[PDB]
Amino acid sequence: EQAVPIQPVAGAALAAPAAGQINQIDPWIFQNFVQCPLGEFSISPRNTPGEILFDLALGPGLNPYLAHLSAMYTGWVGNMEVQLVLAGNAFTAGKVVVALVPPYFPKGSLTTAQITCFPHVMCDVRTLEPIQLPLLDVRRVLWHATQDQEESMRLVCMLYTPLRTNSPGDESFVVSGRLLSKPAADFNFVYLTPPIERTIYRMVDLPVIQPRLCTHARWPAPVYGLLVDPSLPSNPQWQNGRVHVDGTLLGTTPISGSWVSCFAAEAAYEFQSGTGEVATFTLIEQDGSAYVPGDRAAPLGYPDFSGQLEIEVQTETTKTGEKLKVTTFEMILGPTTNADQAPYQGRVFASVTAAASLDLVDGRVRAVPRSIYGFQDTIPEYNDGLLVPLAPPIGPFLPGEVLLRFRTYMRQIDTADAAAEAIDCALPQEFVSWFASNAFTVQSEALLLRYRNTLTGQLLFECKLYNEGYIALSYSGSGPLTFPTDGIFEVVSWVPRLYQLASV
Amino acid sequence: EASGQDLVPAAVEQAVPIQPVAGAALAAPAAGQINQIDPWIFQNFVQCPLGEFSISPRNTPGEILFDLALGPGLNPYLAHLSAMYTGWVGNMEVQLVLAGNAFTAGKVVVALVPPYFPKGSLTTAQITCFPHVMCDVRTLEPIQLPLLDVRRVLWHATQDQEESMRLVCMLYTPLRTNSPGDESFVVSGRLLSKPAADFNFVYLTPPIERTIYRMVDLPVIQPRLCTHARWPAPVYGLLVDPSLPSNPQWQNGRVHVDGTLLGTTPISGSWVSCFAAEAAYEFQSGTGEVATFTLIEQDGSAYVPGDRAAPLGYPDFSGQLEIEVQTETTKTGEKLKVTTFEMILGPTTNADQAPYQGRVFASVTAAASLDLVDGRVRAVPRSIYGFQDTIPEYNDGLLVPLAPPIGPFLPGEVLLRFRTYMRQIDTADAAAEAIDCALPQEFVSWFASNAFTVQSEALLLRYRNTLTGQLLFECKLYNEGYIALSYSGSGPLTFPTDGIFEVVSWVPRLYQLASV
Amino acid sequence: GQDLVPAAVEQAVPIQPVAGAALAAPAAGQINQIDPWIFQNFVQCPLGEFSISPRNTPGEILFDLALGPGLNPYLAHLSAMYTGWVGNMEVQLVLAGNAFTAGKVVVALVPPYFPKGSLTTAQITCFPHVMCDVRTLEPIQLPLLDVRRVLWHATQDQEESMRLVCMLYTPLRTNSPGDESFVVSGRLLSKPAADFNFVYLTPPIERTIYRMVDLPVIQPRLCTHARWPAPVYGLLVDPSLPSNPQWQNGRVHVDGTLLGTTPISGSWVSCFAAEAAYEFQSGTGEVATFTLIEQDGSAYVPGDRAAPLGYPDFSGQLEIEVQTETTKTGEKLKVTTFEMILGPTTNADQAPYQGRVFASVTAAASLDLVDGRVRAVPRSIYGFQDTIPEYNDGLLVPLAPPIGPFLPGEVLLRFRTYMRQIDTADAAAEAIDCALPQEFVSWFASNAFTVQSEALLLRYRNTLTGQLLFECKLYNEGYIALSYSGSGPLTFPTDGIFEVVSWVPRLYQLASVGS
């Protein structure tokens, strides 16, 4: 290893008197250096000194084996050994610094002058053998608990002196670095407990379902194709189909796919001498519950597009025979005024152009889509003309990255053109249900995904699913490009925010 | 020593897989004083503050019989001493007594659960994955268990609760009896404890009476000298009656044991069935004298519709209520009088009331153009006609927040009622009108003023006569503020009113009572 | 008989020694020793000033302090290069009393994790303690031990430690005819005890906690008003003016969290930015509808603030100057004057909380203009009223609370400026007051000060002469108090500098100012 200005740290000798048990680990695990999650970097000649290359915390999460083992224990203590591997040759120059930051040091940005005031080592990019460091358990408690995250010693690596090299004309030269680790001889677990499947160290996974068998999250229809189209706007403001990976629902997106583009309301019918009868809807929750306006633009599932649509309602009439029917209505949602539509407050209006009297009763109805006229990809009007709390736009994307969109075709009544009508979404509803039910723990910023064919095995592309709930692709084309709908998405690993993808 | 040993005796099979744990030796260099406990306390096992339980043949495998957290609250001595310290540390010894009849059969499991294990979900699969002990219910000798202080700090704080080792007992195998005669026995289990050698407290602090351990006590008053919580009358009877509805929705007299006041119940017993309002009068050649009342709090503060169905102390039944109101008349010869008004609080009908904007009406039948002035007044009940034990409409067809109905009850369990009789007008019936409550106002004020800390789920009480010092029955008071007891008969049962209720211990819901 | 029991024994505190570095060394990375001469001198604590008055009642807490590096200026300065600390201290108390004064205080050692409610006078003597007369001429000293459950303490976390609490055991009374305004002064000093050190050597960082608050060296005459874009012209106190105003601008905590619609930049006050849409058909006039956004270009979202940052918080009619693009023959862009209404108005829809503003001009022609983004700045005020305007239709919007909760005899210091008013009758200037001027709103939220007490004692002193003009209390909520019992308004010269003395408790009694 190296001489670092620090004292030895006691592990199990400090924890043993108040531990019920001290548990030993498979001795073959002390003989292998394994790659750490989020432990890689690339240095380029364009990078400037002071960039953080990595920042890692001590704990069972650095080692996949120890992470799996910690599901059947109450606590852990002790230190680790770490290796940094750099890939340069003899014609490079530049320097890197790795320092040991103590558990309670404030979070923020460090300069090159401050990084040298920690216990640290400084390494040239021409180094041949791996650089060996200790990671010690500096703490104020006797042992750590496995199922919560505490403060611990950190390992921070920052570019110190810039890389100076030549390059060919075709590819820029980079210096790659990787960090590996293993437990030291003083490492232990504490108390054998019944294993738990839902652990903070649990990798995210996706349902094994091809997108052609999923459901669209904005319109009640099957997914008919996945694609990318740079010509269309890049940062929409869709209020349905938005979910965090940790399982937080954004906007008005519901859990179930039967709530999309629908609402439940108390309906009062009043015949008017002019156009005809008018039905007033007082909105409530779809499952049956009071609707109080708040942080949401509308009750969950409310349509989030602009246009004129028609709805079908279960209606009970009083005539000379015929208790109940199912009639249609007309509803306006666009920026045309003429109705005072305020879905945010919870009042809507509808009507039908009819003669004679059509008196009915108020009977706890539910409304469903029929068709759309003049549909446009723009936010509806949740107030009279006012503003509402709503979800942020989708993005931002790194330069050379573009959104991947799941597309379906909705019903049309326009007489102008007859080509198609396509509405897109960020994720199908099955992914929404999956993320909302599993409640994963997020590690850094984004997950490297992988689309491949079921039985042939051919890789199609690699993409990035951001924590916000949208998938980005590194594309540089100009015309729309579609993909086969018969593959399966698989999760590879967590990646940092600035991670360039392989192109199409 | 004893008669037939067709039983198990000693369950000396422990070999519990656990290392010894250090106690006060780790804490001494970080405490600023030298403290020690009276050595005689380390000498005998005493019953725990929540050390009674029961196993019945109706219990199913997986049911939790007890779970005790390590700390000063397992010992009455240590619980009383903990009021003068900030801090404890150390181990404990527990004795389990379950020595059931030779005709029974069954098994329990006792496990050592470490700190930070999630509470709630604990199944028959997971219990044996812990260091544990298997016990027969016939076992003659007391079973001895260690409770270790597994921790990652140096000592614990007496006030507030931290994570410590738990001792959990599951029913492993159902309890069944082999005897030919018509009945299955019940096993009555006891828990005793004492501190281990290196147990200690840390820093001497002023002894505060209101502390988390303490103990819930009740006032020493006979029920016949108490006041009713639903009608201003003395308590006249103690009754149980299975025929009456078992889950009523009374809004008065409802108090949580920890102290929280529920429903519309007041602290004082003079607010019950009374109300304060701003009165405005008018005269009509039809109905007569019509008074509109805008209700305000009976202490003179204004009333705002919030999380209560009505202002504090409002009547919570249906009927026609004759009330007396003080009125001032400008006509010569009289200045101040008391008048009787009629109040309609029954079912909704074709009536003219608008409580929505806070105007609630009363009527008086007369012909002469009575002259009266508006003001403020407090109205108290005088009589009831057509009484019905049912909640009145508060928002007139719109739901209002209400206290939950009283319940649930274990099978065979029935509510115990404090009964009083009210003045009423009857057209042709000579009987007295009876109204019941769950707890008299004295207990409501006691719990409101004392602010106790609950421990498990319920309290076991014993009712004892003062004339002979002889116990009448045992009952369960739930944390929700109602008392239940085990009765399987048909006709009503009445009890003497000159006894005293005494607190015995903390018990869980599934505790099986002896039948009365 | 046998023994003699003396009647007069000197006071002392019995202890059992508490281990410091011996407990912590095996799990600390380093154990770092401090300069040995720091162990030899008592030095005033940063929170080390308090007062006793005959208006205080027994059982009032005169002070309380937490063990840690923040009790000593040398230790507070050293703690910026370490991550932790362990060990014990000693504290010294000095009181400036008289032969007139009768009273007793008790100083007690309250352990960590004792419940924080309210101790009474009988319970305070059950802790280890010292009893002190207010007539004492010499200092009194006590030990502060590191009773704890952890191995060491993090420096940047306050955590829970041993406390030192002093309360009034017996009432303060003078034989004088009274009642007078005699105040007993008290000061606290400290030093580390033998077992004390730090834990892990880190880069020295100046923006840490235990960094004493300071103030910019700028005279008030060279500052900016925080509610109107004008230089500050007056410094005054007025008991006749209302005592608890509800200003939404100019509010900031000492820790730097902004309240209300306070902006960082000094060019944002009383201005707004919006997209404008202009309409006129035959006789309505050129009516402009503004959809507001944040002044930096960011979209406005209705949230925890009553309006976009920098919005006016005074009622009246505002006349503003706005750049507009015309398309008539000749001329492309000009600057026009517009009228708008801030306060309540029947039949009018003004909800800047929701982002909708309406303005009008009187036009003798069409003078049609294209739509786009504009920035509107104030130009004139008509009917200026100092009150909260109509933020919503009829609803309650999130607002900053009123100033409050001054002690008896305590009034609010005001920074005064003059606006550009258009009226027809009175030529008197109209004045607007602020609690803290700009350059004080900045210098907050750029420094993350940790307060460690309830009020700051300041000293106003001229630079040319050095004489003290007045002393005041700066509350954590971001306003200043003075002890002024007079009736008429009083003003002060505006060429002084505010100087930070120390941290004080809320009950601290200021010396009276003026007559």
Author numbering:
A (entry chain C): 27 to 530
B (entry chain B): 15 to 530
C (entry chain A): 18 to 532
Question: What do the authors of the reporting publication say about this deposited model?
Answer:
The T=3 icosahedral calicivirus capsid is composed of 180 copies of VP1 with a molecular weight of ~58 kDa, which is divided into the N-terminus (N), the shell (S) and the C-terminal protruding (P) domain (1–5). The S domain forms a shell around the viral RNA genome, while the P domains form protrusions emanating from the shell comprising A/B and C/C dimers. The P domain is further subdivided into P1 and P2 subdomains, with the latter containing the binding sites for cellular receptors and neutralizing antibodies. At conditions found in the gut (i.e., low pH with high metal ion and bile salt concentrations), the P domain rotates and drops onto the shell with intra P domain changes that enhance receptor interactions while blocking antibody binding.
D348E is on the exposed end of the C’D’ loop, far removed from the antibody binding site. Since D348E can escape neutralization by all three monoclonal antibodies, it was expected that, like V339I, the apo structure would also be in the activated conformation in PBS. As with the V339I mutant, the sample used for structural studies was sequenced immediately prior to cryo-EM data collection and verified to contain the mutation. Fig. 8A and B show that, indeed, apo D348E is in the activated state where the P domain is resting on the shell. The loops in apo D348E are in the same conformation as the wt under activating conditions, but far more disordered. Therefore, the D348E allosteric escape mutation activates MNV in a similar manner as V339I. When the aspartate is replaced with a glutamate in the modeled structure, it is too large and collides with T343 and T344. However, in the activated conformation of apo D348E, the D348E side chain rotates up, and there is more than enough space to accommodate the larger side chain. In addition, this orientation places the acidic side chain in an electrostatically favorable location, adjacent to K351 and K345. Therefore, D348E could cause a push/pull structural change where the clashes caused by the mutation push the C’D’ loop out of the wt apo conformation, while simultaneously being pulled toward the activated state conformation because of favorable electrostatic interactions with adjacent lysine residues. Movement in the C’D’ loop is then anticipated to cause a domino effect in the P domain, leading to closed A’B’ and E’F’ loops at the tip of the P domain, a structural conformation which is resistant to neutralization by all three mAbs.
